[PDB]
Amino acid sequence: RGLFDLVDDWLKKDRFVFVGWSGLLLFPTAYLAAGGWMTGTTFVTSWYTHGLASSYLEGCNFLTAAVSTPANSVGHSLLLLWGPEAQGDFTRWCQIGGLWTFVALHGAFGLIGFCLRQFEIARLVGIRPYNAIAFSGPIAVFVSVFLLYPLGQASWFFAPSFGVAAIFRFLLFLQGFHNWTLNPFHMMGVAGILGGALLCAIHGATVENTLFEDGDAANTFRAFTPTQSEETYSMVTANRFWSQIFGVAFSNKRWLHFFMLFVPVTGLWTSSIGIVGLALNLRAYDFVSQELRAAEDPEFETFYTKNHLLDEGIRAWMAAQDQPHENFVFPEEVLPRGNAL
Amino acid sequence: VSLWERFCAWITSTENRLYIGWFGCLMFPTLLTATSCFIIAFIAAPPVDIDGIREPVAGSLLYGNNIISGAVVPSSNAIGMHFYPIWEAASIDEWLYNGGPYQLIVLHFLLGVSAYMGREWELSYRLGMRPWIFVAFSAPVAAASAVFLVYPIGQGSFSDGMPLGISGTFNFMLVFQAEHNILMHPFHMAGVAGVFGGSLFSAMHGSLVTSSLIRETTENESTNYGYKFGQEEETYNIVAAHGYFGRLIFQYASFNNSRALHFFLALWPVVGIWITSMGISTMAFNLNGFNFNQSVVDSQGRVINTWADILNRANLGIEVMHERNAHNFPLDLA
Amino acid sequence: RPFSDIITSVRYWIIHSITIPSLFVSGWLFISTGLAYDVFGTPRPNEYFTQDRQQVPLVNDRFSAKQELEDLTKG
Amino acid sequence: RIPLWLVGLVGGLAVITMLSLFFYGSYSGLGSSL
């Protein structure tokens, strides 16, 4: 009837890719985060920001290419193309590291626009919105690492660059400087990721091994029409199996599939709380009862004090080349070496 | 009628509370001895010379540790790969000093887990099930035997084996990074994709079932009570969750077949952990990951740094600091 | 129209037998004519270091960062 | 009309000429440490 109704009926039309209202936020912003990454890893260097090479023009393969974080002198500037740093020039915008905030900002509005996509399709199909709530897990890892972690730090420079090996140094930068593995929020996150991979490997292998005979063929994939009301696997058998192997087992398909939602997602929320606590440098660095004892008793050694000496090697050896803006000129005689290494 | 037939009828009975089976004849004595020695060695066990340099590393709770720092320490560098039981130790005090209980726990563990795996086969035979849950459990058995058995073999000592603890795990992972460069190795890459993908398709499948549940309860009681146990009606509209994901990405990327869907949940992690556990295995024999250090040069020939060179300087920090007294010669051959 | 009925048709491969090589070679000429080094400011292998500047160039200012990169890219 | 398996054959070996070209330039040109 009205003008709003014609636009509402056009976006929600059955077509190849469902656009909806949320596609106006997703499809422009996701196309430019992805294309900003493919351009930045192919053409744009890191020679002026980090003093590296992170492009395909500079000989890096898929692994050692990245869209890199800007300089520490930029601080937390948004680095707009028209801004006071770039001033409209495209070429000087790329050399400062403007594509990285271009990827991260238009990417953050892609994950907004993709989670709104999951509320919109669920309302048209008419189902409960648990996909949009389980996808809030990965939103809490993008925001609290690519956004909330460099905000608490000195600049955008201490953020993960969007490249394969550039994530890998961020894994190593976070052990030596922060002792991230000791943090109980990672420990509750590893329990959800390795726990979530566990549940789909079991529920994959128990459904597929309690199937009913619905055909004479040896292939069991053929014997399932999608609109049938009979269940395709014996729940009573699978309960009787695991009650004797493992001792305790699900007797509820509604509780089972909810539990496959809770376990992976909670590991992304609990691990997201800790990385917000490392923006503020509130790290779980030391057990002081272990540290006061190892200072007074020069014979008491645990595995825990062995990890601190591994972190002095990370804090001293890479920090010269890690942070060229700070100009660490270490002598050879201050770098902690071991015996004969 | 015979005594053996009345014993085979009991040991293979599915009417027991826990199925014992013929693999339980060597699962249960193995894993209860790995357990009962682990609880004692984690709580009350004296310090252990791990580096073979007579610098004993404390690992138990009574010697001032906690849950995180306490760990069953691996055996000595002095022993190395030699089999060191209690009777070949001339006292228990000489046994506990040189890293005794690490070999008693690990060898009774790998026998009991390889028997827990065959026990999952056996009950599937006696219940009429198709058999292959135990093939999915091969993937953590591959990974448990990689860090406790295969990596001490190729490195030639159980002292390079994984410490049974929590802080000892991260001593194992970091030293393995400096000496082998696991992150650049494509088999750790193929299993990070296995568990990121595994936790994806777990929470992606578990949401689309819970989204499309059928009304069987009221708003006061729980959602879960609309499933009566052993019912024959399907508890969720699978056509509904197919039409949702058929619009969320596109139409042809959606499994309408629930059997092929529930197979892909078992394929992706298990193949990802088979491949990963043969990353530790091929890096047990010093076939390390990629090494792109000093790979990008200018026309003058000066080395231009990459992200691998920054990653190298993190590896050089752990390499020059791990086992800071055990080395005497310029190259860590072990 | 179904997707597999498109790519098996001849009229599809009539059009895209011209457009694909005319677009792949334009991606070749975008590099071999030295154009990509000037749009994105990526250093050529000749020009990581210069005769004067022998260190690693870094930006050291918030607001005159455009002017400082005018300095480090002339020589 | 073209048989579909001919299409996946020609495009499939075209990818191999693209991939093995990329593993070629890991040992030559830039990024080869020569």
Partner: peptide
């Protein structure tokens, strides 16, 4: 029409692969 949907993703992709094959033959 869906000619704007695919070719916003495929016309760039062939253009960048025209550049990635050219960078294999560039040396110092």
């Amino acid at each position: 029409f869906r000619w704007l949907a695919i070719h916003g993703l495929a016309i760039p992709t062939v253009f960048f692969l025209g550049g990635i094959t050219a960078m294999q033959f560039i040396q110092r």
